[PDB]
Amino acid sequence: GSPEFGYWITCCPTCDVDINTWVPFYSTELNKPAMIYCSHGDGHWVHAQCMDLEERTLIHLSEGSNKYYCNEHVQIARA
Amino acid sequence: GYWITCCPTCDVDINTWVPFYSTELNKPAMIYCSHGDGHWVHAQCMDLEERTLIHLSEGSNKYYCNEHVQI
């Protein structure tokens, strides 16, 4: 694994991903879980599955140029 | 904190500074080095090409100045 590469990490308090039990879920995955970037604070990456993102929602987010805030931070008054 | 001498080879000087990056106007772009307690350096003094600077600013990846990159 090695967390320094960013994939095999605990992305959030409810993070399920573990290289020992992970299996591909999205049609675009091979040996690594799809991840999306949250722009909260200094930023961080979270697994798409941990965010409960449906494939077309995930792919839709990646084709656009919008920022994304994870389920943990999206409701923090971001003024 | 803008007009500090950020490293032994620092070229940013308040009596001579001019915009270099397309995002600069009256102040020098800076990036935060995560070494030890941390410290700020002028991006230009690190010889960072603009796109590298921008990518660093858009990500959550840590940055270490040319002086501290090695452990």
């Binding site: 999205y26 675009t28 690594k32 879980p33 799809a34 970037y37 995930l58 | 858009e58």
Partner: peptide, 9 residues
């Protein structure tokens, strides 16, 4: 939004 492992295969 930036993403990883989301490219068409």
């Amino acid at each position: 939004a930036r993403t990883k492992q989301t490219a068409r295969k």
